[PDB]
Amino acid sequence: NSVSVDLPGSMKVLVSKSSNADGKYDLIATVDALELSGTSDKNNGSGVLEGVKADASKVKLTISDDLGQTTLEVFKSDGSTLVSKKVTSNGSSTEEKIIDGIIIEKIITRADGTRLEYTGIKSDGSGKAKEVLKGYVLEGTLTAEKTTLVVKEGTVTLSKNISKSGEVSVELNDTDSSAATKKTAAWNSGTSTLTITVNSKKTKDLVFTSSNTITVQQYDSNGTSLEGSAVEITKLDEIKNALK
């Protein structure tokens, strides 16, 4: 009869073992409590499935040709307009809530479980942003150009910027009135490293890892060379300490 096929988003689709007279395969999936069905001209679990919720909302599940991606959509009762969209591929999900054809929320859950949460989003792409890391969260804002997450400590502001393409840059600004103590920093995109300087001496490297972690390493008292080994930040307080 049918074949079960694993899907991204922790789902399953049942596909018929052979095709109908039109060459097409049956699809059935259950999503939470909802039974969806469609047909596909591929044999491998890919295609479209649709369903209806008790509140009349239309639901569509689209499985990409290689099963590398699923898109789970909910529409108004007529199917005309999006209400919710969830795309899962390769460990991660992006979930969007829509009102009036404007995305008012977007939660990206990464494969490591860290999340970027965008809320209260407006027509211009502005809203609040939160990155939820293992151990701590970073708060900030969203514009159309970038996400900016901020950590403040004393007169120092650390900003972690995430481009629309998903790329991370970081900067530090300090309003300190002295110069024995004022922090400045430079970003290396090469190595994803912010090197912090005080009184013409490097004091620390803050590495923003591909694993969505932050490490901190100190320099020698010359501020010429790194010492010890880098230490993974596991709490906001430790980012703050790096900025002291």
List keywords for this structure.
244 residues; Outer Surface Protein A, domain 3; 2 domains; five-stranded antiparallel sheet; membrane
Proportion of residues in helical segments: under 10%
Proper CATH architecture of the largest domain: Alpha-Beta Complex
Compute the gyration radius: what is it? 24 Å
Question: Globular, elongated, flat, extended or rod-shaped: what is the shape?
Answer: elongated
* Backbone structural class: mainly beta
How many domains, as an integer? 2
Measured between the Cα atoms of the first and last residue, the distance is: 66 Å
Number of strands: 21
Elements, N to C (H/E): EEEEEEEEEEEEEEEEEEEEEH
**Beta fraction:** over 45%
CATH topology of the largest domain: Outer Surface Protein A, domain 3
For the biggest β-sheet, the strand order reads 5-6-7-8-9-10-11-12-13-14-15-16
Q: Characterize the largest beta sheet: strand count, sense, and whether it forms a barrel.
A: 12 strands, antiparallel
Text of the CATH class of the largest domain: Alpha Beta
How many helices in DSSP terms?
A: 1
